[PDB]
């Protein structure tokens, strides 16, 4: 539930930033965070801490 909640939290915030029209530094940081949260859901500790 914690891993699924991280995926949902970062996905909803990315939707907010895209419809807010934020700069690409913020949007790319959000996308990289979403990618790392889905990776930690599937296989935790395989890539990184």
């Amino acid at each position: 539930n914690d891993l699924y909640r991280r995926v949902i939290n970062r996905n909803n915030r990315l939707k907010r930033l895209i419809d807010l029209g934020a700069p690409e530094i913020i949007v790319n940081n959000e996308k990289r965070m979403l990618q790392e949260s889905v990776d930690a859901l599937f296989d935790n500790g395989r890539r990184g801490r």
């Binding site: 996905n11 790319n28 990776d39």
Partner: protein, 49 residues
């Protein structure tokens, strides 16, 4: 998802199956999918020539 995400099983674990299919080194693939470098998806040869 509001942005596409790669599966960790097909990117990371040796041998990198995504790297073998697309012919990219794993170090050059990590930089793309974790937002540290750009990749040229397409080029135009008639207009350039």
């Amino acid at each position: 998802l509001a942005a596409p995400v790669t599966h960790i099983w097909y990117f990371k674990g040796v041998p990198s199956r995504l790297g073998y299919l697309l012919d990219l080194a794993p170090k050059d693939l990590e930089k793309i999918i974790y937002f540290a470098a750009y990749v040229i998806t397409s080029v135009d040869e008639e207009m350039r020539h």
